[PDB]
Design a protein around this ligand. Structure first.
Ligand SMILES: [Zn+2]
Lengths: 145, 139
């Protein structure tokens, strides 16, 4: 079926947490534990702003487990990022911390662009395409009838 | 023109930890409070990891001398506000953390943070910072 722990990157989260996708989000939150890095949250807030950002952030803190950039995350990310730099692979800081935080929390990373995280999978990251995730929740919605 | 609270971005922090800079860092740690963003710490650890140093230990060494500032709620909120008006994430968080802590941001490249100045950031090029500290050495 699907693991109980998941996460999103900022672009995927902007999609999931829209007014538009309300129904799909409601089911996702009823069924899964969602562990977001604080860096994902901040990037989501940047999109939601462009506001009463403050009130939006209180909503998010209620409904998601917001994971700080912990020392062990910084450490593990520095190790991963040193490997990626070794291969001339450029992912920005957001992507590295997002991926390391998913490794840390054993959360499946749902993203519209799994391919760019592919080189991190060797450090324990797993990913799922967002279109596929959405399709799976859409079936649950149908099934509720 | 140095205040009691200062911070560095990651390239500056790396330079600060070089052997030739040991005196400058010693004065800085003795006479100022240095408030680093966790993101700056992560980038610095990246540099040390790329050179195969003991990352765990180095983190503990840093935690013992710096005030390491998490990406706090208020920092996340303020940073999003800044980024939405206007630079990568490291730059935004570094600067927002500087604003939050009221630390002077000491950097190799002040000009890239020039757009955050409207939200209250103060910056200083590292070259000038070092001169000011050189002066304190003469004591
Ligand atoms: Zn944090």
């Amino acid at each position: 079926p699907l693991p109980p722990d998941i996460t999103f990157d900022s672009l995927a989260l902007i999609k999931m947490h829209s007014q538009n996708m309300k129904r799909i989000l409601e089911v996702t939150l009823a069924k899964f534990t969602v562990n977001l890095s604080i860096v994902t949250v901040y990037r989501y807030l940047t999109a939601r702003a462009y506001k009463n950002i403050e009130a939006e952030f209180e909503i998010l803190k209620d409904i998601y487990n917001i994971v700080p950039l912990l020392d062990d995350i910084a450490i593990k990310a520095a190790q991963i990022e040193a490997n990626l730099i070794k291969k001339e692979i450029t992912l920005d800081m957001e992507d590295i911390i997002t991926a390391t935080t998913a490794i840390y929390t054993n959360s499946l990373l749902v993203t519209d662009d799994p391919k760019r995280y592919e080189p991190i999978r060797r450090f324990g990251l797993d990913t799922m395409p967002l279109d596929k995730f959405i399709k799976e929740v859409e079936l649950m919605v149908e099934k509720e009838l």
